[PDB]
């Protein structure tokens, strides 16, 4: 309102916090210029050109543009570069990184009861690794030279019973760190406890 009165009279209105300027005085000063004292003004529609039933509060207002823009936010990733440590999609828009599927998202997928979308999102959509484990010991010591279809597991005398499993690369990092920490994460495809 005071910006409209300032735009009509030509004098910048004083907008100090603690003064004696009231709203009724600005309504009178705007009334002296011919417009409605309450800031309303009869508007017409743009599509039909028909008068609007309710008057619109219409007047200038000072605005500012922030740093946040869409051109520095929108980004999509479809098969890009992976990290060197976890072999997972990188972090950052400049490095062409993917979005994070955190723990709460997985908990929501469990709440919906969709296990196939969770498995696909945590394997094919991210990282999927194939390894071979031994029958006697469930460790990843199975040397695989499959150019001639040959396998071994060091330290347990096996060249026949070798199993193939698909686990994420992060889980393999966990198992290898446990083996580096003197912990045996033995994996068995059969149920011995029954």
């Amino acid at each position: 309102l005071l910006s409209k009165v300032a735009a009509l009279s030509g004098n910048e209105g004083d907008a100090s916090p603690f003064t004696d300027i009231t709203v009724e005085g600005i309504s009178k000063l705007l009334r002296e210029h011919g417009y409605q004292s309450r800031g309303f003004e009869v508007m017409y529609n743009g599509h039909t050109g028909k008068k609007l039933m309710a008057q619109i509060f219409f007047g200038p207002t000072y605005y500012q543009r922030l740093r946040h823009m869409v051109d520095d936010k929108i980004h999509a990733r479809a098969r890009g570069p992976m990290q060197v440590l976890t072999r997972q999609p990188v972090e950052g828009r400049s490095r062409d990184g993917g979005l994070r599927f955190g723990e709460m998202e997985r908990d929501c997928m469990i709440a919906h009861g969709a296990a196939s979308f969770l498995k696909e999102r945590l394997m094919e959509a991210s990282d999927a690794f194939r390894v071979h484990i031994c029958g006697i010991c469930g460790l990843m010591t199975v040397i695989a030279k499959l150019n001639h279809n040959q396998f071994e597991c060091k330290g347990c005398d096996n060249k026949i019973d070798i199993y193939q499993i698909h686990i994420p690369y992060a889980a393999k990092l966990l198992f290898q760190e446990l083996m580096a920490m003197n912990i045996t994460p033995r994996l068995y495809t059969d149920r011995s406890r029954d």
Binding site: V5, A6, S9, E12, G13, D14, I26, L29
Partner: peptide
């Protein structure tokens, strides 16, 4: 109710 920014002419015409 507006900011008086013409104090230069008032002070020049008063002093």
């Amino acid at each position: 109710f507006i900011k008086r920014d013409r104090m230069r002419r008032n002070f020049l015409r008063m002093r």
